[PDB]
Amino acid sequence: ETILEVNNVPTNATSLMERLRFPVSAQAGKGELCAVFRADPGRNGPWQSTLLGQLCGYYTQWSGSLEVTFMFTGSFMATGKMLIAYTPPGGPLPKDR
Amino acid sequence: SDRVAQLTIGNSTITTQEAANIIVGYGEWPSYCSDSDATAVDKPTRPDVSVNRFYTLDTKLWEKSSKGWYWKFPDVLTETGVFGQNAQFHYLYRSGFCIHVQCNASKFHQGALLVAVLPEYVIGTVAGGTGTEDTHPPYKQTQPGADGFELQHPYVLDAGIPISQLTVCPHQWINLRTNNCATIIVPYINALPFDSALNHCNFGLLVVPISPLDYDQGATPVIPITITLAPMCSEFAGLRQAVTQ
Amino acid sequence: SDRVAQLTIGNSTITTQEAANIIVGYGEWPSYCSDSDATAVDKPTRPDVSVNRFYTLDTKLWEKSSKGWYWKFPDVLTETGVFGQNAQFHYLYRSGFCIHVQCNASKFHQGALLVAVLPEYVIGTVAGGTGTEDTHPPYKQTQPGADGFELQHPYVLDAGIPISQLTVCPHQWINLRTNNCATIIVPYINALPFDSALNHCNFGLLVVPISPLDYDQGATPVIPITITLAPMCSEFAGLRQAVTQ
Amino acid sequence: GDRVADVIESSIGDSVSRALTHALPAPTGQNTQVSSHRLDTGKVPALQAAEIGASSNASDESMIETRCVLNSHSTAETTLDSFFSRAGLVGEIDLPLEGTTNPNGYANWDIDITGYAQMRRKVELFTYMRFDAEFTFVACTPTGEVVPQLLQYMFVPPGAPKPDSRESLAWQTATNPSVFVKLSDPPAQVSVPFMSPASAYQWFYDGYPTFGEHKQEKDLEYGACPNNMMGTFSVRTVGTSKSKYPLVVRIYMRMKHVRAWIPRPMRNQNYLFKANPNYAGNSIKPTGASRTAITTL
Amino acid sequence: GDRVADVIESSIGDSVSRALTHALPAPTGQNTQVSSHRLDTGKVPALQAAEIGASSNASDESMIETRCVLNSHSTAETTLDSFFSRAGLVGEIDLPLEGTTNPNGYANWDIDITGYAQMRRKVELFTYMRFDAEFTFVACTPTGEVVPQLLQYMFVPPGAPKPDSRESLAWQTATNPSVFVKLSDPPAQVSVPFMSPASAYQWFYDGYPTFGEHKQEKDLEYGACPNNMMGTFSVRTVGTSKSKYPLVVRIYMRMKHVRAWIPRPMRNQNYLFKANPNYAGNSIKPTGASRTAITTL
Amino acid sequence: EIGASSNASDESMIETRCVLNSHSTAETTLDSFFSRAGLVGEIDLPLEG
Amino acid sequence: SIWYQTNYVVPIGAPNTAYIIALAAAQKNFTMKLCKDASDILQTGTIQ
Numbered sequence A: 001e002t003i004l005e006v007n008n009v010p011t012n013a014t015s016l017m018e019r020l021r022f023p024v025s026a027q028a029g030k031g032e033l034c035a036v037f038r039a040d041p042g043r044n045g046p047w048q049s050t051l052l053g054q055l056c057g058y059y060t061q062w063s064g065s066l067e068v069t070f071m072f073t074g075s076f077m078a079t080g081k082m083l084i085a086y087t088p089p090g091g092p093l094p095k096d097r
Numbered sequence B, C: 001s002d003r004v005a006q007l008t009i010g011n012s013t014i015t016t017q018e019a020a021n022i023i024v025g026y027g028e029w030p031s032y033c034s035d036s037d038a039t040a041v042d043k044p045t046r047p048d049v050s051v052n053r054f055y056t057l058d059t060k061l062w063e064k065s066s067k068g069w070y071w072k073f074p075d076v077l078t079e080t081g082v083f084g085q086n087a088q089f090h091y092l093y094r095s096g097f098c099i100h101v102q103c104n105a106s107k108f109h110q111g112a113l114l115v116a117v118l119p120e121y122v123i124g125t126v127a128g129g130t131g132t133e134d135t136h137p138p139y140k141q142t143q144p145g146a147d148g149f150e151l152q153h154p155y156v157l158d159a160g161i162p163i164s165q166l167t168v169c170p171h172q173w174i175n176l177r178t179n180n181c182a183t184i185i186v187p188y189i190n191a192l193p194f195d196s197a198l199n200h201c202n203f204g205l206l207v208v209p210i211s212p213l214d215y216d217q218g219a220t221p222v223i224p225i226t227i228t229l230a231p232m233c234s235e236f237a238g239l240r241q242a243v244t245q
Numbered sequence D, E: 001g002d003r004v005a006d007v008i009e010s011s012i013g014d015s016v017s018r019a020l021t022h023a024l025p026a027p028t029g030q031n032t033q034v035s036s037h038r039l040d041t042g043k044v045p046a047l048q049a050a051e052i053g054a055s056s057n058a059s060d061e062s063m064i065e066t067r068c069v070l071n072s073h074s075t076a077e078t079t080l081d082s083f084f085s086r087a088g089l090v091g092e093i094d095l096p097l098e099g100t101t102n103p104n105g106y107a108n109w110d111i112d113i114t115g116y117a118q119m120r121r122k123v124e125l126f127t128y129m130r131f132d133a134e135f136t137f138v139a140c141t142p143t144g145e146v147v148p149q150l151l152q153y154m155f156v157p158p159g160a161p162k163p164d165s166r167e168s169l170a171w172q173t174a175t176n177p178s179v180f181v182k183l184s185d186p187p188a189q190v191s192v193p194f195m196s197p198a199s200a201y202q203w204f205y206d207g208y209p210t211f212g213e214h215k216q217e218k219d220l221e222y223g224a225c226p227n228n229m230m231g232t233f234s235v236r237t238v239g240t241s242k243s244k245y246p247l248v249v250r251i252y253m254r255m256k257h258v259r260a261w262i263p264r265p266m267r268n269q270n271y272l273f274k275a276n277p278n279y280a281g282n283s284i285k286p287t288g289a290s291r292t293a294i295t296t297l
Numbered sequence F: 001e002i003g004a005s006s007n008a009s010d011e012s013m014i015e016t017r018c019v020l021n022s023h024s025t026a027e028t029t030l031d032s033f034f035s036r037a038g039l040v041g042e043i044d045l046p047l048e049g
Numbered sequence G: 001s002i003w004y005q006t007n008y009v010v011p012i013g014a015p016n017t018a019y020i021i022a023l024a025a026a027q028k029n030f031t032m033k034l035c036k037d038a039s040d041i042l043q044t045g046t047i048q
């Protein structure tokens, strides 16, 4: 496992490190959206930051299951429950939870 | 090692690190209808993975003044995913359920919810207050769908019975200082082997605060309660066109 | 005793007293995908009786001037019953089909229809007539749904190929003096073990009169051609929300 | 035939409902065993986690030092038949001379035992019940006087013609079961089998009997289960001319061969209607008695 | 575990596709057996029912009196490899000096063999085909003259950077396979494996490559199967300055180790476009020759 | 935090079917990846220069 | 897609915002075929 830049938005030198992590914070209980990204590993986007994505570039075809492990780095006193979903081909970006 | 748990069914997995074991209602697991209990002759359809999976249907906000809520089964799912479609296209339906109510807070919040399952939860009305009027609950109150419905008089469960005795039904408590969820597995309960998923609600899920939510100013005040549930051993028969009610 | 037949599958039964045997395409019966041909890892769902049954989708009128029609599979069913729902909720689908085309008349009518199945039936256009314009067929022509679509140039099957050689594909003829129906069983045909029931049409059903309908004034002039079909060994995988296209 | 592995190894179709518990013989209350002082670390019987949903497993032996007690107190009187096989009033039928109700010498009573609170509160402790029953009919005048009058009781199952008069052709009773008896005779008494189309009667049905839009005007059908509607009980004075006496028929029921499933909270608000659990909203009373402070008796 | 009967006895999951037919060795044409006059009732080989969909089962022996003929004519030249393993032209690439096309000394050709009718009509006899292939590259000037020029051919699979110039960094060809050869050398020749993500290439795909609304502007994607798109073939003259000669590269393909499924009607209208079966609607011609009357040669 | 990668597999996260995977791992060996000739040097020998 | 199932809850005294780091890799059934050049070429002019 290598770090997946889910937060691939900042682009100025001084903010590059911010792409290595994304945030969560207290909300209003309406099952709000935290983040999204395509699962395509050999496509332009977050996966380019990973060593898998880069090695993938040296091959025309791939096959297999992928795995993304999310690590929470808030304080010990912070709790919470998230729903992480994978939508197979054909399904448009989910409008709601 | 009883505090931690993983529930995997279909293409869905649930995890919890503050559980309080699991309750198997009336001590028995869901099962398919046997050939001697059955009466209908058509060969049933058992979709398996496409319908026996976890569906997260709704989130309510727990407030210091909340009175409590209830949902009806299988009503909450009759319009969701592949399970809903089968329920609509078929006259006969039967299944069990794995219910997982989620609610987490902080080690500085407090409160306790009673999570219980009550078969044949018939709702009553206040009878015009004086009790001389034979009023009846409207369809949206008896079968509230996924949004559920808020109890008007929790002390008598809106049906003239003491909530203090609700613990005689399969339950768990979500006491914030202890756990952040309740998990109850319920078998099919009825006097018939199959029934209409539309006209009959086998049981109701009750989530009622017994010890009010409390916390000091400054702590996260938005404390959601989410309802996730999975049908188990779903069977359907009596095929024809889809009907919503 | 080869002229008579009964087709029973699911909760549906078809009878015919003027059949001409049954064709099993490319000599093989429908079957479920084996564990070595499969590639997708999720456990599939096999609804069985609720989706593998006969659906009567459409009726066309045979006239002395009719040019012919075609339907696409699984397109004709993507919006019908429980089969349609599974096709919409899942990315992957695979199945076979039992096709029964019905058309009866009297011993004084005459005419012959060619009923055939053509895998990967790509439709072409006349290219602006002169052939200098690279026009393309619209979605309603490539995937006409249950109503089917009428051939503009049957002689070249609207795709630059001779209908005179269509018999190299699984077929039967409905010759009025002989039989009143055609029955063709087709296995799953593709270069992949599963595919999208929405983006890909595995084969087309062609019903074309080769010997024109004729009868004397006074005989019933309305001669319908009805299309009934049943999915066989339906399998679905890759569950998520329903999508129509 | 089957060949793909997931099919061969699936549990789809298992009709054997696995049970986490089993019954044990318990003809007497449990005995008490000698116990002594325990001063341990790790062992803590007094501490529980009520959140789990189970009741405490702590016993006398582990909380205090006990002596031995051979308990031979019977558990026999708390069986379902012991509790329910006691006849109670469930119906009353009036046949007055001068009146507004049934002044024509006949009456039709829908078989529904929920009109009397004592009996009703007992049965509603359970959701489903299957049982046979013994019915007894006590008849006299409104003063409790016994008069030389002949009566006819007839059971009219759903679909059979309900008498519409003291002289109805339906009293020919060629197939329905009828009982002819005098008020001077002892109370009539018969045995009734479990007649529902269902496996059990149910005192609560959270649903509707039919499909369709459930608009306001039809909401009186919420909770109506035909599986509980066994028919009509018809009574008449046997004659073509009016009876000389005003009569009353009290109906008692004694269940026997009882089975019950799904216990539930017991009614704590007065009953108002037979068909539903409606309670008087302006008089919601506590389940029991109250006091002035939590620190005072 | 399983217990209800319909589950135990179902065929759900049978992966063994039952086959009504099996192949037989047939290295030669069938022989002819002696036959004699038959004058029977009940036996009628000459009568068929074409409606069934099968071809006639009648043979020479049953229609006329035949002699014995030992037929040793081989069936070897009609195998798929015999028919397809003959190299044909499938591509042409121009590298002119003065021009409108590729005047910059390089060119990118999308690997698509449907631009030439001879080869195309043969492969389109089948719906699916799986094969390896031998590619040969013949290069010279437009007069067929051989000049002392060095060329570079490079295979750029989908996703690899396509050269955009004769001096593109992509020609470093560190992973893509490249061939360096002189026009003076014999034609370059290599073996190509079956590279599709699918089990077979397919000359017809009745569908769309993506989900969504298939509006007018995207209808050019009807029939587009990426499983058939193997990449780009790039060619350049090896130098930083323009070549002194105008060149042409003809591409030949010889399939080998061929398998094919689902035969279909053979094209009978001229081809117009590589990507589809469009035909000129105002020139729909009969499959073959015509005559003046059905009663005259 | 331990520094190891997840040990979770498809089988434990969702209900899976059986799949006999015969896809080769041969093309990702070091020789497969590196034994392809690439440009590493260029030497000019001009007349006028 | 990542959604809030309940809510991020914290007591008085702890930060109202925290971050999540995502790590990715392939499962053991993952393989690759048809060796090709990467889409990038990390050089502008000649490397001296």
Ligand SMILES: CCO/N=C/c1ccc(OCC[C@@H](C)CCN2CCN(c3ccnc(N)c3)C2=O)cc1
Residues within 6 Å of the ligand: D111, D112, D113, D114, D133, D135, D153, D154, D155, D177, D178, D179, D190, D192, D201, D202, D203, D204, D228, D229, D230, D233, D274, D275
């Ligand atoms: C000469 C012939 O003498 N014939 C005597 C005779 C006596 C009794 C008789 O049938 C007795 C039926 C009772 C045993 C059960 C009554 N039950 C079932 C559940 N139920 C419910 C359930 C849910 N809501 C309401 N409101 C009511 C209810 O009221 C038939 C015939």
Ligand SMILES: CCO/N=C/c1ccc(OCC[C@@H](C)CCN2CCN(c3ccnc(N)c3)C2=O)cc1
Residues within 6 Å of the ligand: E111, E112, E113, E114, E133, E135, E153, E154, E155, E177, E178, E179, E190, E192, E201, E202, E203, E204, E228, E229, E230, E233, E274, E275
């Ligand atoms: C130095 C390196 O030298 N490299 C040489 C070299 C040669 C060939 C090559 O790949 C050859 C691919 C062909 C074998 C098959 C072409 N195919 C498949 C089906 N198809 C279709 C299907 C449906 N519609 C259309 N239009 C087209 C099609 O065109 C790669 C590299």
Ligand code: NA
Residues within 6 Å of the ligand: B195, B196, B199, B200, D207, D208, D209
């Ligand atoms: Na019902």
Ligand code: NA
Residues within 6 Å of the ligand: C195, C196, C199, C200, E207, E208, E209
């Ligand atoms: Na597709």
